Design a protein around this ligand. Structure first.
Ligand SMILES: Nc1ncnc2c1ncn2[C@@H]1O[C@H](COP(=O)(O)OP(=O)(O)O)[C@@H](O)[C@H]1O
Length: 364
């Protein structure tokens, strides 16, 4: 091979995924955190491990970069610590959130070429990459991560900004809600350490009920839905209706005091904002992505809820890839490996010729 490996870096609100184009999975995943004492800067797992003696910062808390100084440190960490490569020696494909401000796109571009001296780079919308990973160029993606969720209609490879909806309800909120209802049950999960334990309980024992009320009735009259969970100190606790009550908040945000529409309604509203001529393509190609869409039963629940909102004559299909937790990264690996994509990279030459603003033309 003549070309060096290209890098794929998925910038997540909670976890960053990094690896090499062509691979089937990211080589590294770490917390999008930077910490400094209350070694001068700590990034990733280490910052989390030593959070006791540090003040943590979340530079991309809700999907959008808010502090470029710390984001630069996360990227430095990604190259030198996680992937152990020199960025000046590899093209880099970066991901961005839907509705990312134009100025931010230019900033990312300038930093890659001027700070890291990348030989080439490109930036793609997360939702679009997930759609690519599913083998489609048209459809609507419901991306629910750690600090944010989005419904992104995509037609022929292009996201439709006017129809994109943002929901400030995701994995983080669900974890805290589970801590709250488990505490109401009689336990006590309130500390940061306990938040990590509940996050684990959430990822392992929660599920989306097909019918909330029926599930609540079953849990109230029997122990058939109860599951045991063992804490590190040996204590075994019981999780009952909390298993499905937690993710139910995605469909009924009021449980969290939020007036926002649930994910099914948000998906429907996005589709309705698109040209009537492509709505059927979206209904027939609703793809789920992100860690928060991993709950067992979520696909069937979405199918049921969307069917209730859409015309009776509409064909509804929910696609839930088993590997959807990393579909963004995988889509990037696929894209960066495409023969026709090689001409699309922004080269250092092109950057020197046109400057940061070239990103709008090259990465439309
Ligand atoms: N199996 C699972 N069930 C439910 N939630 C999960 C599961 N696996 C991961 N999560 C949650 O998904 C979120 C992270 O997903 P991700 O798409 O990586 O987000 P981001 O890109 O914003 O960091 C976290 O809140 C995590 O707890």
């Amino acid at each position: 091979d003549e070309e060096v490996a290209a890098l794929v870096v998925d910038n997540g609100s909670g976890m960053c995924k990094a690896g090499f184009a062509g691979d089937d999975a990211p080589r590294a995943v770490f917390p999008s955190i930077v910490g400094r004492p209350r070694k001068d800067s700590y990034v990733g797992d280490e910052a989390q491990s030593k959070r006791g003696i540090l003040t943590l910062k979340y530079p991309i808390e809700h999907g959008i970069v808010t502090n470029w100084d710390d984001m630069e440190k996360i990227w430095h960490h990604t190259f030198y610590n996680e992937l152990r490569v020199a960025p000046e020696e590899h093209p880099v494909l970066l991901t961005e959130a839907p509705l990312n401000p134009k100025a931010n796109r230019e900033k990312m571009t300038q930093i890659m070429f001027e700070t890291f001296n990348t030989p080439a780079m490109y930036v793609a919308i997360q939702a679009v990459l997930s759609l690519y990973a599913s083998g489609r160029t048209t459809g609507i993606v419901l991306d629910s991560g750690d600090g944010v969720s989005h419904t992104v209609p995509i037609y022929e490879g292009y996201a439709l900004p006017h129809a994109i909806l943002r929901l400030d309800l995701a994995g983080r909120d669900l974890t805290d809600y589970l801590m709250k209802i488990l505490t109401e049950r009689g336990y006590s999960f309130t500390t940061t350490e306990e938040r990590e334990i509940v996050r684990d309980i959430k990822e392992k024992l929660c599920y989306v009920a097909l019918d909330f009320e029926q599930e609540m009735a079953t849990a109230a009259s029997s122990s058939s839905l109860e599951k045991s969970y063992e804490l590190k100190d040996g204590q075994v606790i019981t999780i009952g209706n909390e298993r499905f009550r937690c993710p139910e908040a995605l469909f009924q945000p009021s449980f969290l005091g939020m007036e926002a529409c649930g994910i099914h309604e948000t998906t429907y509203n996005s589709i309705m904002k698109c040209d009537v001529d492509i709505r059927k393509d979206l209904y027939a190609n609703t793809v789920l992505s992100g860690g928060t869409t991993m709950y067992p039963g979520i696909a069937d629940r979405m199918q049921k809820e969307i069917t209730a909102l859409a015309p009776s004559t509409m064909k509804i299909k929910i696609i839930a890839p088993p590997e959807r937790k990393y579909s963004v990264w995988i889509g990037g690996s696929i894209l960066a490996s495409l023969s026709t994509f090689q001409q699309m990279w922004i080269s250092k030459q092109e950057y020197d010729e046109s400057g940061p603003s070239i990103v709008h033309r090259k990465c439309f």
